[PDB]
A paper describes a structure:
CPS1 is a complex multidomain enzyme having two separate active centers that catalyze a three-step reaction involving two highly unstable intraenzymatic intermediates and intermediate migration between both active centers. Bicarbonate is phosphorylated by one ATP molecule (ATPA) to give carboxyphosphate, which is then attacked by ammonia, yielding carbamate, which is phosphorylated by another ATP molecule (ATPB) to produce carbamoyl phosphate. The CPS1 monomer presents the previously inferred 6-globular domain architecture, with 2-domain and 4-domain respective N- and C-terminal moieties that correspond, respectively, to the small and large subunits of bacterial CPSs (these are heterodimeric, intrinsically active and NAG-independent CPSs), with an extensive interface of ~2400 Å2 between these moieties.
As expected from the mutual cross-talk between NAG binding and nucleotide binding in CPS12021, the active form of the enzyme represented by the ligand-bound form not only has NAG bound in each monomer, but also binds two molecules of the ADP added in the crystallization mixture. Each ADP sits in one phosphorylation domain (L1 and L3 domains), with the adenine ring sandwiched between the central β sheets of the B and C subdomains (for the boundaries between the A, B and C subdomains), as is characteristic for the ATP-grasp fold. In contrast, in the ligand-bound form the entire B subdomain is well traced in this domain, closing on the bound ADP, with loop L1β11-L1β12 being fully structured, having at its center a coordinated potassium ion (thus the name K-loop) and being involved in intimate interactions with the bound ADP. The two phosphorylation steps of the CPS1 reaction also differ in that the step of bicarbonate phosphorylation requires potassium and excess magnesium over that for complexing the nucleotide, whereas these needs are not patent for the carbamate phosphorylation step (reactions)1941. In agreement with these differences, in the ligand-bound form the L3 domain had no potassium complexed to its K'-loop and it contained only the magnesium ion that is complexed to the ADP, whereas the L1 domain besides having also two bound magnesium ions, hosted a potassium ion coordinated to its K-loop. One NAG molecule was found sitting with full occupancy in each subunit of ligand-bound CPS1, in a pocket of domain L4 that is close to the interface with domain L3. Of the three non-hydrogen substituents of the Cα of NAG, the α-COO− interacts extensively with the encircling L4β4-L4α4 loop (A-loop; residues 1439–1445), forming hydrogen bonds with backbone nitrogen atoms (Gln1368, Lys1444, Phe1445) and with the Asn1449 side chain. The acetamide moiety of NAG is hydrogen-bonded via its O atom with the -OH of Thr1443 and inserts its methyl group in a sub-pocket formed by Asn1437, Pro1439 and Asn1449.
Numbering used by the authors:
A (entry chain B): 1095 to 1130, 1138 to 1155, 1162 to 1479, 1485 to 1493
B (entry chain A): 419 to 1129, 1139 to 1146, 1163 to 1479, 1484 to 1493
Write the structure that this text describes.
């Protein structure tokens, strides 16, 4: 149906052999999503060893460096008569439900929005939608790809409804039972409602301390246990309020930084920024050398697996306990070398009750927002 | 008659010094000719501001490609369009060189594409200075002692044989690129080195500085009929490029024997060279004998053909194009007379003067001296029936601050206290005309002035006459001045303003006094034949030297004011706006009256309107014309600043202004009123304040934090004037729009690539926006709704915005068409000026399909990018770096499925060349956090990286390999380091990235690096955003707008 409508999507294929798998993954390039437990893989070997533990398997090109956009909408006889577009803070790869949502969009091109809208017009018509639905999109510049479509209310319907001051479900319920509906003041595709004087941010809630030993790190499978949302004149304010609402506590002391090597180009400015705001920085071995080599002062710390083997280096558990460290930033990826050690760092923060950031985009936005009591009703006035 | 069914025509691309709008004008005439003969036409020109590139009308090609005029892309177009003819003579040197390269490669032969008109062989013979010499030696014509050489060593040899001083001039170039007088060995070394970065062959030639410089425009058809259509005498002698010269037409100081000798030599040479079409030829004539030298022939339309066409009313490009189809001159109608052929040589019963316009004050490194390499950014043409009349008009046309021929400088600048008046006279400059006035005033003999300036004394006699009239008038008053005297003053070009200052009156009073004596100008036609046959057209000028009008005044048409001379910040976009308006009026059956003085423009082509006055855009003269025609109204919003600044004065003198009231234009240009209006509307803006004291300044700057703008100039530290908070790290957004009764009925929002701080006109524009929040767009839109309503806008306007997240601040509002109106109009497929013109004259408008605030038009399937053009190589020693004052000389635009593609196409269209070798990187320390990723990216794409000292240590410390290089100021002090000059020369480095800011430590050294790249002819990037986007875009076609609009 999407091909017929000329609506783009990530290359995918169902396969029943390892050789089909490998052939396809080769034909589109790693990485690839895998649905036999969703799971991503970055290499020929990584795959073989996932399958040899799991009847066909769907493969999808994992698009890297991509924004993710939610379309929440209501259809009437295949036309869209209410809709709302939000952008995740995080790149595609973090699951919708673990994602932090911005409404209205912040960094999406106007042409992409037009595509998101046009694709939604065609989908609503192709499936004769009369009721609530949702479409998730990858966006990379002007490439707009459809990920999935759900012909039902999505979990972001309350956020979107309250934020825009329109009960999407009230509208949808009326459509479904044939009650009349005035579309003049609804956010149709032709006349969206876009907040000008305020922004809304939805943040996920987690229950890591209660999930004893759980690796507090976002996978393609979802892990959050609830949501909060707050409002602000801009993103930084709204974002800080949302984060505080989750239990996140703004550090008053030092920040521990450990990142996978490939994040360095993008992280340098995040680190300079945290330093210019006056936060004392601690870091794992390589990250500390690197920061100092770039004239950002950091104090190195010991790996947990190596406590005692160098008396010049303090243990992290001790720096946390002493109150020297009250935020941890840990950014692993597929090429992380010290998988266990970094797991221990992440789990130590959780079990010490200090906040932990493991996503680059969230971490960037945080650093920007600390650079400096209202609610929706204030802004709607 | 050549049989061709489809012709490809090449444009010049973006405008640049020496290669300006004359080719938009020419190429539009060519397309018209082609259509008359039923020939399908394809156009390639990335200059989106050109009128040429429009879709509608008899001068518009059937198909338009916005792509680089380079062999790569012209080949793709040829392949796709399979044309059988090629016009390469109407796009300046760009089109010429591209066409010769295609020919050399056999692409033309390969796809069966005939060159229409002058052959590539004739072209090569006029572009290669050696072949030219061979050709003229074949017929024993007269040239100066010279040698064409291909190296610096050979040039030195030639100069010793010939004897100093010598002129060098480049092959395969125009406008004196790489040229220069060389009094000595060392000057020759410096200049030839620089010349060879831009050509493969220079001519080293004995100097004939001071000889008279005489031009002819020559036509020759395929029957071997050959005529000289125009002849021009340069007032500035040999040594000042024709383009940077004052020029008169026809000649004034030649004898019949001189004039006919050179005419007949022109015809012989042009015949021998096999030229078919039009061409321009230049001579050096000895001032006191019959001795002459043939200097060059330009086998192509030129800035000189445009000028001649306007001077004579003979449309050279139109004729050229008909000739290119094998139609001979007797079979082509003189469209002006309507009853005769184009086989003739016009007769002028008036004299025209062209003067250049320079903009040099802003380029601190470049002198205002002028010579063999053009530096002017525009030109004007005035017509009068005395030299003095023609001449003083032309001076006023150049810049609003110039009153005529006076001993006072432009821009109200005082003469330096250390002035050496003899030096000024002997060394030409952009201000020498006024230095002559001064010298005549200070009692230097005319003989000594001729001796130092080389300007023929006859011209100096006229100048003295003008200054004697000034003396006479200064001793008079409103009671004492007679009618006989006033009449004479007007007859030699004195404006009412100049007279007012002598008499002790205001300009208004003086106008009243004059009309009270019934002294007024008369309206005369240019008919090409000095009245032998009457004109069917109305191509008009105004003169005090006559006793009747040549036309009636029954039309009462709608007046449209044009742009005047192009200059920096005011280019062909303002001819586009004006022409769109003129065409809209015509299409609606309304009589039109146009006033403009720019010879390069399609607005000054007589076939576009019912009455074209090629005249001054002064209050005085517009009033003369408006009241004489009894025009129904005047449109002052589609020609940039000049007409817009007349809004209130016109209003006050009984002129009916169409659209937005001049009262509203005043309100909006009044910073205090405008700002207070914005406060009322709750629309944000940067903190600002007017101050008279240093302590107020420092107090304010302290109260809002540095940096601060200053009125242009920014300052970052403590170490009346308007001060504005400079907002850092901010996006910039343009709103282009049309209002009807205070409502917005068309609009378009674009985002600059660059952060605020680079001027709009030097910025690269993206449409639609790319990184702006949707809430900011809503604010931009809401602020525009309120502004339109507050100023009751009915017509075109524009608002510029700072955007930082959701903070949206208004920078400025202009109640007229902006320079981005063509870009926006063509990109969205809606003529904003057509819409605006209909609003202004009360015509109906269907808003259903227009981009109103409620239903914008936003391209989904494509993006548009506009890139600025620069003329750094011609601005000798200029620091090629963007300030708050603007520096670009033109624009291009291209289209793509996405931004990377569109951006690469736009950049290539500017002459930017994708590096194949190493990249040099030097950045101010503060750019490091953001630049690291740009550098890794360039490294991962395989570019070898070079860098200045600290930058190289830093890259290597971050595991990005870089080879350090030496500072220019330190070459030899470390043998482990290569010099940059040498790495460029060797071909190791073919892109330079230099990112200075206010904290740059090595200011001079980094200036030298930047200027080295320019003068070596390799691309230079000095803006971080542009540099980031480039790196992203090289990570990975030949389509254009029409593809994507399908
Ligand atoms: N092609 C892709 N490239 C990159 N990330 C993707 C892609 N497809 C899905 N994702 C990520 O996986 C998440 C879940 O995808 P979805 O198909 O909606 O699964 P679920 O069944 O869990 O709803 C998305 O929200 C997105 O973050
Ligand atoms: N031999 C010379 N002596 C002095 N001036 C010269 C000489 N040759 C050319 N010039 C000057 O240089 C200008 C540029 O030369 P030209 O041959 O017209 O090259 P271009 O094609 O670049 O305009 C001329 O118009 C003239 O003023
Ligand atoms: N408050 C500001 N902060 C930063 N940059 C600014 C600010 N105001 C103006 N600029 C820059 O200066 C340029 C020129 O400003 P503008 O008011 O449009 O001057 P002009 O009279 O030359 O049109 C703008 O396009 C912008 O890039
Ligand atoms: C989180 C992560 O991947 N850490 C890095 C190491 C960073 C350091 O040594 O400072 C790793 O490869 O394990
Ligand atoms: C362009 C610029 O500012 N360069 C840096 C020099 C850094 C280097 O040593 O490479 C400067 O401070 O002058
Ligand atoms: Cl859901
Ligand atoms: Cl403008
Ligand atoms: K996501
Ligand atoms: K000259
Ligand atoms: K030539
Ligand atoms: K010339
Ligand atoms: K200067
Ligand atoms: K007087
Ligand atoms: Mg889903
Ligand atoms: Mg030439
Ligand atoms: Mg020339
Ligand atoms: Mg402006």
């Amino acid at each position: 149906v999407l091909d017929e409508l000329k609506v783009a999507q990530a290359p995918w294929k169902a396969v029943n052999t390892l050789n089909e798998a490998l052939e396809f993954a080769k034909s589109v390039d790693y990485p690839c999503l895998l649905r036999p437990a969703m799971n991503v893989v970055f290499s020929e070997d990584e795959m073989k060893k996932f399958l040899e533990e799991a009847h066909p398997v769907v493969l999808t090109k994992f698009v890297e460096g991509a924004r993710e956009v939610e379309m929440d909408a209501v259809g009437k006889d295949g036309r869209v008569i209410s809709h709302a577009i939000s952008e995740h803070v995080e790149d595609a790869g973090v699951h919708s439900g673990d994602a932090t949502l911005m409404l209205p969009t912040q960094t999406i091109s106007q042409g992409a929005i037009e595509k998101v809208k046009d694709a939604t017009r065609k989908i609503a018509k192709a499936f004769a939608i009369s009721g609530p639905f949702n479409v998730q999109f990858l966006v990379k510049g002007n490439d707009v790809l459809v990920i999935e479509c759900n012909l039902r209310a999505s979990r972001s319907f309350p956020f979107v409804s309250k934020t825009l001051g329109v009960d999407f479900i009230d509208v949808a319920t009326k459509v479904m039972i044939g009650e009349n509906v005035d579309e003049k003041h609804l956010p149709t595709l032709d006349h969206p409602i876009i907040p000008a004087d305020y922004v809304a941010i939805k943040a996920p809630m987690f229950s890591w301390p209660r999930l004893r030993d759980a690796d507090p790190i976002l996978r393609c499978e979802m892990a959050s246990t609830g949501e909060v949302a707050c409002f602000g004149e801009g993103i930084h304010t709204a974002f800080l309020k949302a984060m505080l609402s989750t239990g996140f506590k703004i550090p008053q002391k030092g920040i521990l930084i450990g990142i996978q090597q490939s994040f360095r180009p993008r992280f340098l400015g995040v680190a300079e920024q945290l330093h210019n705001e006056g936060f004392k920085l601690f870091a794992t071995e390589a990250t500390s050398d690197w920061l100092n080599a770039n004239n950002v002062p950091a104090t190195p710390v010991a790996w947990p697996s190596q406590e005692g083997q160098n008396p010049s280096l303090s243990s992290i558990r001790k720096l946390i306990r002493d109150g020297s460290i009250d935020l941890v930033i840990n950014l692993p990826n597929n090429n992380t070398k010290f998988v266990h050690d970094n797991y221990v760092i992440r789990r130590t923060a959780v079990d010490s009750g200090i906040p932990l950031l493991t996503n680059f985009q969230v971490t960037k936005l945080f650093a920007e927002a600390v650079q400096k009591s209202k609610s929706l009703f204030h802004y709607r006035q | 008659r050549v049989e061709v069914s489809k012709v490809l025509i090449l444009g010049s691309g973006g405008l640049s010094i020496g290669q300006a709008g004359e080719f938009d004008y020419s190429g539009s005439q060519a397309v018209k000719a082609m259509k008359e003969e039923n020939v399908k036409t394809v156009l390639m020109n990335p200059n989106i501001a050109s009128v040429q590139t429009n879709e509608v009308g008899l001068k518009q090609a059937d198909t338009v490609y916005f792509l680089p005029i380079t062999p790569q892309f012209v080949t793709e177009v040829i392949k796709a369009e399979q044309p059988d003819g090629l016009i390469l003579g109407m796009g300046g040197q760009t089109a010429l060189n591209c066409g010769v390269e295609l020919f050399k490669r056999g692409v033309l032969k390969e796809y069966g594409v005939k060159v229409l008109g002058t052959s590539v062989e004739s072209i090569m013979a006029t572009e290669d200075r050696q072949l030219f010499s061979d050709k003229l030696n074949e017929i024993n014509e007269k040239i100066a002692p010279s040698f064409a050489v291909e190296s610096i060593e050979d040039a030195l040899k030639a100069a010793d044989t010939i004897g100093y001083p010598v002129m060098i001039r480049s092959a395969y170039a125009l406008g004196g690129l790489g040229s220069g007088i060389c009094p000595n060995r060392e000057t020759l070394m410096d200049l030839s080195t620089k010349a060879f970065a831009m050509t493969n062959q220079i001519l080293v030639e004995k100097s004939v500085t001071g000889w008279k410089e005489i031009e002819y425009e020559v036509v020759r058809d395929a029957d071997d009929n050959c005529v000289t259509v125009c002849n021009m005498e340069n007032v500035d002698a040999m040594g000042v490029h024709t383009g940077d010269s004052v020029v008169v037409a026809p000649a004034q100081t030649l004898s019949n024997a001189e004039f006919q000798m050179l005419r007949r030599t022109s015809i012989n040479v042009v015949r021998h060279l096999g030229i078919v079409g039009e061409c321009n030829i230049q001579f050096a004539l000895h001032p006191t004998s019959m001795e002459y030298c043939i200097i060059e022939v330009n086998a192509r339309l030129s800035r000189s053909s445009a000028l001649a066409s306007k001077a004579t009313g003979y449309p050279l490009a139109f004729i050229a194009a008909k000739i290119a189809l094998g139609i001979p001159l007797p079979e082509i109608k003189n469209v002006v007379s309507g009853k005769t052929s184009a086989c003739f040589e016009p007769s002028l019963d008036y004299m025209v003067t062209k003067i250049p316009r320079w903009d040099l004050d802003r380029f601190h490194g470049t002198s205002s001296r002028i010579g063999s390499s053009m530096k002017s950014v525009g030109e004007v043409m005035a017509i009068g029936r005395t030299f003095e009349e023609s001449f003083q008009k032309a001076l006023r046309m150049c810049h609003p601050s110039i009153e005529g021929f006076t001993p006072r400088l432009p821009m109200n600048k005082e003469w330096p206290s250390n002035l050496d008046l003899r030096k000024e006279l002997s060394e030409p400059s952009s201000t020498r005309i006024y230095a002559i006035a001064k010298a005549i005033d200070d009692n230097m003999s005319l003989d000594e002035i001729e001796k130092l300036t080389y300007i023929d004394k006859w011209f100096l006699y006229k100048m003295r006459d003008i200054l004697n009239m000034e003396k006479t008038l200064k001793g008079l008053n409103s009671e004492s001045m007679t009618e006989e005297t006033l009449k004479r003053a007007k007859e030699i070009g004195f404006s009412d303003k100049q007279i007012s200052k002598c008499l002790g009156l205001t300009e208004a009073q003086t106008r009243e006094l004059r009309l009270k004596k019934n002294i007024h100008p008369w309206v005369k036609q240019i008919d090409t034949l000095a009245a032998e046959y009457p004109s069917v057209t109305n191509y008009l000028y105004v003169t005090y030297n006559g006793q009747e009008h040549d036309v009636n005044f029954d039309d009462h048409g709608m007046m449209v004011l044009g742009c005047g001379p192009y200059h920096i910040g005011s280019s062909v976009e303002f001819d586009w706006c004006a022409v769109s308006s003129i065409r809209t009026l015509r299409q609606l059956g309304k009589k039109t009256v146009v006033v403009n003085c720019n010879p390069e423009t399609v607005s000054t082509d007589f076939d576009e309107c019912d009455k074209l006055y090629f005249e001054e855009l002064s209050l005085e003269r517009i009033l003369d014309i408006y009241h004489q025609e009894a025009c129904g109204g005047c449109i002052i919003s589609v020609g940039g600043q000049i007409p817009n600044n007349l809004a209130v004065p016109l209003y006050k003198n009984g002129v009916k202004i169409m659209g937005t009231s001049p009262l509203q234009i005043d309100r909006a240009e009044d910073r205090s009123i405008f700002s207070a209006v914005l406060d009322e509307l709750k629309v944000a803006q940067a903190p600002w304040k007017a101050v008279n004291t240093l302590n107020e300044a420092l107090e304010f700057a302290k109260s809002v934090d540095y940096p601060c703008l200053l009125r242009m100039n920014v300052v970052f530290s403590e170490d009346p004037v308007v001060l504005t908070k400079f907002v850092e790290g901010a996006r910039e957004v343009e709103m282009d729009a049309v209002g009807k009764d205070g409502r917005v009925i068309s609009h378009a929002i674009s985002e600059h690539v660059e952060d605020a701080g680079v001027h709009s006109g030097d910025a690269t524009l993206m449409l639609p926006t790319q990184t702006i929040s949707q809430g900011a767009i809503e604010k931009v839109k809401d602020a525009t709704r309120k502004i339109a309503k507050a100023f009751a806008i009915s017509g075109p306007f524009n608002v510029q915005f700072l955007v930082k997240g959701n903070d949206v601040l208004v920078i400025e509002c202009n109640l007229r068409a902006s320079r981005s109106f063509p870009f926006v109009s063509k990109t969205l497929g809606v003529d904003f000026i057509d819409v605006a013109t209909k609003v202004m004259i009360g015509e109906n408008v269907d808003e259903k399909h227009l981009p109103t605030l409620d239903h914008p038009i936003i391209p989904a399937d494509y993006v548009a990018i506009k890139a600025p053009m620069f003329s750094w190589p011609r601005l000798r020693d200029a620091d090629p770096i963007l300030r708050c004052e603007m520096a670009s000389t033109g624009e291009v635009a291209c289209f793509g499925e996405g931004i990377h593609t569109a951006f690469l196409k736009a950049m290539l269209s500017t002459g930017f060349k994708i590096p194949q070798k190493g990249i040099l990187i030097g950045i101010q320390q503060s750019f490091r956090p953001r630049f690291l990723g740009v550098a890794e990216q360039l490294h991962n794409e395989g570019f070898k990286l070079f860098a200045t000292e600290a930058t190289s240590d830093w890259l290597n410390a971050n595991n990005v390999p870089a080879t350090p290089v030496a500072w220019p100021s330190q070459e030899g002090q470390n043998p482990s380091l290569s010099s940059i000059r040498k790495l460029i020369r060797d071909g190791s480095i073919d892109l330079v990235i230099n990112l200075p800011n206010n904290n740059t430590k090595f200011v001079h050294d980094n200036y030298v690096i930047r200027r080295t790249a320019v003068d070596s002819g390799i691309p230079l990037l000095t803006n971080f955003q542009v540099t980031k986007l480039f790196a992203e875009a090289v990570q990975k076609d030949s389509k254009s707008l029409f593809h994507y609009r399908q």
